[PDB]
Amino acid sequence: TYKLVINGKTLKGETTTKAVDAETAEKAFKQYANDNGVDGVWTYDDATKTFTVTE
């Protein structure tokens, strides 16, 4: 796999993670964003297995 794109005011980038289901990921990404001081709106496309955080 899944991809996460971070569109922040000060931080812009991308990271990846391996998980057995989408739910498990979401949780991992939520933790990552927090550790980096980023807070926003989350979007996810099942077709591309990508989550986007804007912010």
Q: How would you write 21-32 as a 3-class SS string?
A: CHHHHHHHHHHH
- Give the domain 1-55 fold: Ubiquitin-like (UB roll) (3.10.20)
Q: Where are the domains of the chain?
A: 1-55
Residue 40, token pair as written in the block: 């926003």
Nearest to 25 by CA among 49, 7, 55, 47: 49
Furthest-apart CA atoms within the chain: distance in Å? 31
Closest CA to 27 of 47, 2, 10: 2
Contact 2, 19 (CB under 8 A): yes
Residues 40-47: contacts with CB under 8 Å, at least 24 apart: 40/8, 46/22
Experimental approach taken: NMR
With vertex at residue 15, the alpha carbon angle to CA 26 and CA 51, rounded to the nearest 5 degrees, is 40
Q: Which pair of structure tokens corresponds to residue 17?
A: 């993670």
